Amino acid sequence: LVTPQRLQRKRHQRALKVRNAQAQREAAAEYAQLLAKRLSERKAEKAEIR
């Protein structure tokens, strides 16, 4: 039977999955920035060694 509880459960499930995806994207972006910064500084050190 179609009842408000089922609608609420469906909506909550959708919202959960969307929020999970957004959180994973944010974490991936932050990791990418950290990697880029480390990569830049090590390249600078290699330039200094030369």
Added chain:
Amino acid sequence: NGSQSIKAEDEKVVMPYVLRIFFGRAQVPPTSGQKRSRKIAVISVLPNFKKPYINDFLSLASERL
């Protein structure tokens, strides 16, 4: 050139049904890996068809437009 392939004499009659059937299969939403493989197959059999029969399929695609 397949053993079970349609004979040339009967190719005229059967082929319109075959072409229109593949048209319906081509309209499946190519949405899951099995379904996507289905859409690839229906387009891959076109070269087997003679060019006049390849042409009519394109006409069928453009009829709705």
Added chain:
Amino acid sequence: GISRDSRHKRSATGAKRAQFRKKRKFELGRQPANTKIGAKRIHSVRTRGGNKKYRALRIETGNFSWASEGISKKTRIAGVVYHPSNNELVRTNTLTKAAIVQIDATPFRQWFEAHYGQTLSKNAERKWAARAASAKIESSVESQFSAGRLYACISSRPGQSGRCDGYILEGEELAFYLRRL
């Protein structure tokens, strides 16, 4: 009936071992599935754990990969021509890994016609001209293309995965197997 236990064998010194314990389920074996060309029959097998295995009792189509151009197409299987382990499989047309088989040549021929515009829109002409340098292929493969049946080797295990995928013989592979043929 079939078991893979090693106790029933003689020892390296040749001693006849005594019977330690009754057979355990975790050294079982199952009857061979002699795959053969024909209309598809596959039946699932419940194996150890929740995993499942596919048994190809019959199969007549397989995904074969032309390695030189890095392409792969589905193709009907014509028949088994040579098998290294035993010739009785060749006689009975049983499909197993490493069996040399003949496959239809049409889909590959269509793909090569379209991709290079050679035989064995401006955009099409541009693409064909750009790829024209790579058009040449081995003579042995082209002769088979003329015949319409290509020699291939099965790289899948039909009795396990339920597939008969493979690849087209080339170069020294093709020369050696032609000599054996």
Added chain:
Amino acid sequence: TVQSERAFQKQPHIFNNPKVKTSKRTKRWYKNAGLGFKTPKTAIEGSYIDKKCPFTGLVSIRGKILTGTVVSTKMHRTIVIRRAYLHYIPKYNRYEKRHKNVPVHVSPAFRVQVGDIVTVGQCRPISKTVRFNVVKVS
């Protein structure tokens, strides 16, 4: 002659492209077993095919490393070595010579005679009795 059997011998998943034809020599894959064991140049530049070779096959050297004296080399690509040791009897406070024969797979990259000293490494079960593989000769 390498191709001396009914089936073709090839390194699995090592593909030589006929179209490119970059080099006359067929592409050959090799690995270093570790533990400071040097991969012989014969294996690097050889033409044999052996799935059980430690440097060119699909076998890894892990676990115990033993040494022995070759006692038999009459079979194909395997040998039988003899390991001798002293077992202690406490009642008589004295030792005894005991020996055990170990069958070891030897890759064709090595040439071993009856009497030389061979260092071997444990690998996965190759056959009914072979669980070791020769990794150094002397």
Added chain:
Amino acid sequence: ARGPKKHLKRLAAPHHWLLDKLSGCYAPRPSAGPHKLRESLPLIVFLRNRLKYALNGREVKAILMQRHVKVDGKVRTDTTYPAGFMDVITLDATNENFRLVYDVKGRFAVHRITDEEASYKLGKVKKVQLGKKGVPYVVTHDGRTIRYPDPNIKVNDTVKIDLASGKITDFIKFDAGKLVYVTGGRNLGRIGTIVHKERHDGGFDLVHIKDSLDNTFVTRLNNVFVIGEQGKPYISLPKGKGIKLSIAEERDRRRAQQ
């Protein structure tokens, strides 16, 4: 046996739980969980045989179903949940936080900590590897997988994990001069500083550790847990500070305080 076992004899139970050999015939079998069976302290033993808050198993169950016990900030209701090394046990109604740290004798000790210390734990980096979709992750000693680790973090390092969010706050590299805690062998529970790390390829690495008293001992690398720099541990230590002390002096100071 035709399958996994579900019973544990008292004599076969870990010695360090300190269970009466005549109380019964069976001992609590730790269920599957973060820690191994032999290196874990089930909550029943902690609540009954250590804190003495419950008099029998049923009362422990009654406490747990009331949801008053939290492990690493999460409520647990299993009597045989395998709490282990560096685990935080929180009792809100009684208002205590405990950290499961071995004493010098080699036994889990009731060590009370403050809330700010209970907010975080330490984990030895057991593995680092790229997961699916090219996402790096680190597996610690307690089965925690943390994605997107700091690239400098490697195996044998220590990571300070915040319980509320389960993310790395800081980390310590495994190097000479670092403060370490022994989690195995007869030197279990001792504390010292690394001196040298002896490596054997294809074998078990050995580490030399010097205590504050200048005594030296060698232990396999698997039993070493970096806990900070010398003189600056990142966690509060139990009484005795992980120093092994002889038997004669044990007589001596017992008499002195008595």
Added chain:
RNA sequence: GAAACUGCGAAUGGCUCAUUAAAUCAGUUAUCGUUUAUUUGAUAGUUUACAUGGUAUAACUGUGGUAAUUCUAGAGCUAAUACAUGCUUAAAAUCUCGACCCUUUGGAAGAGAUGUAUUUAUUAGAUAAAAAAUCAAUGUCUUCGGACUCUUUGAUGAUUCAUAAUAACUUUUCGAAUCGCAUGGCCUUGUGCUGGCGAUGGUUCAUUCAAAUUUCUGCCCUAUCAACUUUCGAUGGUAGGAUAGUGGCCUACCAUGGUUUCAACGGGUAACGGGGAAUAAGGGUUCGAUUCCGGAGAGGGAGCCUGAGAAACGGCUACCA
């Protein structure tokens, strides 16, 4: 809340020592050689919906058979986290096929494809350290001359490792049609939109409980047991089948190998092994079915469904007594 369906357990525990002489077992190794219910942690915008069927039945109503059993026949009903189906959710990027304009150094509307799972083929997974010239394709830039810098790569002692990419493939999976408690927030005032704390499921990875196999050393008496194994696999190679997987485990073709006076092989054992027990001054000798660990069994052989896990026996099927 009886009954029944569904889920889980019944493979734990308890008992006995029949068989078993490098077998079990003790210590010590390995899985880069594989399965793993469950716990724990991560992990899925890529898949009529105000929510699909009997392709369906139990319990139940009613009509019956048999001397007899935890036997059940026909007919009538009705459910799911059972069974079977099936959508609905951002943007961008990349790769193909490309109408047409135009012959360029070309451009290009558009049409497609991309998560996961399986199978195959191919590609990347760099490096001991420094500089040049050309052929072809061909991209950024300026001061139209020539210039072009910081250019991306983890782990192991070691890998075809982790991971990623290209092309297809699938009687082919998964990607929530489930349930409890409570009624908060927005407003365009609609039973409009949104939203809290939990339970149960689900792909993959890791952890844990485990399983399987495995490396070295170690067993009482017997030489009046000296040669054994190999026709019907014994040793090893190649290919396949099967296995969760390595492997003569099995198949086909090959060679003639493998153990042995450092005692093989065969025979005896009132031989389950060990932790231990007794005695002794020490060396030793003997006992150990028996409170724990490990192995095997359920009268004797043989074969199996289910399930993550059984060759189960207080599960099933034959034969023997």
